[PDB]
From Swiss-Prot, chains A, B, C, D:
InterPro entries: HTH-type_TrmB_regulator (IPR053499), TrmB-like (IPR051797), Tscrpt_reg_TrmB_C (IPR021586), Tscrpt_reg_TrmB_N (IPR002831), WH-like_DNA-bd_sf (IPR036388), WH_DNA-bd_sf (IPR036390). Lacks the C-terminal sugar-binding domain. The gene is trmBL2. SUPFAM superfamilies: Phospholipase D/nuclease, Winged helix' DNA-binding domain. This is Putative HTH-type transcriptional regulator TrmBL2.
Amino acid sequence: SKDRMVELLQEHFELNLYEARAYVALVAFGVLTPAELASVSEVPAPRTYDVLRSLEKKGFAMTQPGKTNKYRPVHPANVLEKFIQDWQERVKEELEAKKKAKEELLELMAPLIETEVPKYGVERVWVVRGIKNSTLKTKEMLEEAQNEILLADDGFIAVNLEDDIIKAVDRGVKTKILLTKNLLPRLKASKIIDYAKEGKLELRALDKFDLPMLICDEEVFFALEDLAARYFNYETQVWIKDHRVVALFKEKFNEYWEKAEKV
Amino acid sequence: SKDRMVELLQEHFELNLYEARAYVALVAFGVLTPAELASVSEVPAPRTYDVLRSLEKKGFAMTQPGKTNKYRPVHPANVLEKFIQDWQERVKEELEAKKKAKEELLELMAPLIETEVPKYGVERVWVVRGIKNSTLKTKEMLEEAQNEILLADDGFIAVNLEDDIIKAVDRGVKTKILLTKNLLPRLKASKIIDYAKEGKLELRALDKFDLPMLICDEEVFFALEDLAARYFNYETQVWIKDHRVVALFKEKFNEYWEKAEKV
Amino acid sequence: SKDRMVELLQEHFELNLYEARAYVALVAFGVLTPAELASVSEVPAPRTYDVLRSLEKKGFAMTQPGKTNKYRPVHPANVLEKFIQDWQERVKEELEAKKKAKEELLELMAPLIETEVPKYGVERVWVVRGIKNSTLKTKEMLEEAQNEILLADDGFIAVNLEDDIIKAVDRGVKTKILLTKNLLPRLKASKIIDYAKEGKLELRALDKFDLPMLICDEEVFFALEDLAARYFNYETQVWIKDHRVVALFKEKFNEYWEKAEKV
Amino acid sequence: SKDRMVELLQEHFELNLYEARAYVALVAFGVLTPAELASVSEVPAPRTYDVLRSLEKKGFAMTQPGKTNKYRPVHPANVLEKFIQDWQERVKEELEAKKKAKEELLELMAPLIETEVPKYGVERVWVVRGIKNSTLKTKEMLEEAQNEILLADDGFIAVNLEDDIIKAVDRGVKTKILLTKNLLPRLKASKIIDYAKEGKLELRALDKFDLPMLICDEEVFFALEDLAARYFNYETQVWIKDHRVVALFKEKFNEYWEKAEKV
DNA sequence: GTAGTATCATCGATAGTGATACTAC
DNA sequence: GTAGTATCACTATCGATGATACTAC
């Protein structure tokens, strides 16, 4: 069928409907002029000229340039195979590009390939105010703790965390507890003081320090001192995850720690 | 350069702008929820979902069997290599489809191409556009050559037509082949060698000649010369069937041939 | 009016409708949360979250990351001014790009710059049949002649050509007329023999030549000898414009021409 | 080449695919009718007309009164130079519009920013995304500085804020500026350099310090550090107003400051 | 109606950009 | 209701491609 011939030329050889109908006509009728083509095909008369001129450049037709151009079809066995061979050459190029593209992309993404898995995760700063949320955040910090826990506490933070502190120490994370001397009686026969006497965690006391902090593996949790709101459980507290910043606080802690006294 | 990565992905790996961005984001942050992606990247918030699902579908990102709100990138080393290997398969199959379409067309058109003889005949001049289409006519010249074949190849007059030349030589056609010296390197790597050294034909090389041509019996094929035309793959080539015109060109060929090397 | 404020932010500072309404809201109400933003603006509740996060990256808002994020507007005098200067630097870049682009384009188009103006067009091959069109083409050739006219004629002239040959010769174009001896008596009172004797043009006679031709300034006009379409007279004739081809015929003409004379 | 030209034209000179091609064709063949263009080029025949008219309008081609429709290219040296010069004009006017839109917005928002005193106040921690937006906060820090300013600039903490620094010094704020040695070579003249020799401030250079910062009274501004974040212009910067936290950072500054050179 | 010129119209893919639906409290 | 989530629908550009005037007769 000519319908089938037209379909195939469109589907596999990059000819539009009109160009395809034209080339079939040229093959069926041999030599045609734009005028003749129109009479023996469904190619619109107005379009015959450019459509045939289109087959010309694509290699499906040869031509005689004159007052009225006449066209002959190239032999389908020559052009169709030519098309395929050329196509394969394009493919062969598009392929090599893809490989060089791949090689380069891997070189570009080299520095970015990240094994670490974010748990929050794009967030490295978190602002907490309530007493509920301040505890839920310390809980997470102690749970995700894998290396060291440094706790300089002015009050309830260390007494309420005891359950969570113990569990962490059990996993093998180095724990250092630093309290204000006035808070000691709050730890009567507590499992912390028990662990401290065993050697499973370091415990020390200081009369005072101005910047209490919780440190967990490059995570620091501190408060913005407001005694006004500190009565109001709505005291602002900040969680920051960064090697540099947390390292700055760790220095301060070590300053405290090297001046305190173990129980 | 994130921009270069996005560019490459869009070009050689069939990702849209957003998907390309999303993948680099995925590769960068290791894990991302749709909202997180909308934040750190330039992918429209409302598009992050379909963009991420799309990447997953294209095998560029994965979702855990758990709460599927988080997406992780597939490692570039794996995903990029897999795309290229898979792509080769898709093209290879399209090749088969194309070949099947060609063979079918040749079959469908068989009845059309009968001894007429043929539908296009008695025409002694045709024009062919583009040096790339040179062989679409010269092939016919070689298949019908009965007496003599005189080729002064520029490297495009009779590309990949060697089989027809040796076939012509077999049916008793005298063949003189004149090549530019830069062509010889692909006779290694030939079939006319050892068909030339056998004496079944002649082969001579030459540094420079201004009028490359193919003569077959009383037919001459030559290309015109226009810088602008060739930039647009539109160079004009002419086929003339005339004993006087051919004879003139043959005088020029002979001129070239008496200066060529017997190599 | 806020409508006016929103209009300006969209028009000049690259904010969509929602982001623009948000920043106006933030400026009006100071600190807002996504929920609050919705209550005091026409920003859809579902969109507030991502829209505010958008103003964040764009530099129109600062934020407190928490269970419920709160946002403050950057001061319009800082952001709006910041935007403009940043924009100016992008412009400064796109400009430098444009200049380099131009420089390169001029280097690429250097070989392509065409001064000559085609009076026929892209066609360097023309196929003519009949006497009407072959004469109109010879006339055009003689009119456009500016350097030399080489005419080896097998018959005709002054078949309308005396007038055109003379007029050309009047313009100062070197003319060479070559007729077959049998044609000499046809021009005994012709203006050509008159001009030849003066001699404003060279005239010579030959008993025979197999390839008559008209040459005009790198244009050649010849016939494809067909027994006996010349009688019909549907004899195919070809016009070719090309230095190489025309030089080939010119060599042939000189072969003829070196065999005089007009007498 | 031709593909590269088309690429440039589309990129830097605001031509669509067809117009860019058409222009290169116009430059190549010197003159072209819509049909001729449709033939030699990849511009769809039915589109050649509007495409050529378009090129003319954009000042890339010119047309004769007819009767035929032939187009000539404008010389690239002229058209390309004209586009760029005109473009500079176009942007320069949009800049004015932007400045005018800004000035108006500040006016419209003036009533909004009334004595609250600050719309946003009593807030002691804010986050700012992207190093590019650093000054959108630090600016406020410097303009409100009453006692002390300690800058350890990385080159982005206080970009283009020199005027505010010298201005702060005038109202009696003690100013210490610590810069990396690679920054100093670009401080010419400047007001910050002949303010130190005058003694109105101090300036010390240092090869390397890990924690660039800005301290103003009881306020600190510092940036976190994440490669992935910075690739997406999403780096987190923090502003904290707390005497204990700032004092800590100040200890670090003083550490940096005791190793720098007086320049 | 016929030749040959110039001109329009429909559509898919992509990327923006102004809005809803579903859902567990 | 509240606070989220998960998608929707629409617009504009453009390059592809099929159809249709106008002007000669």
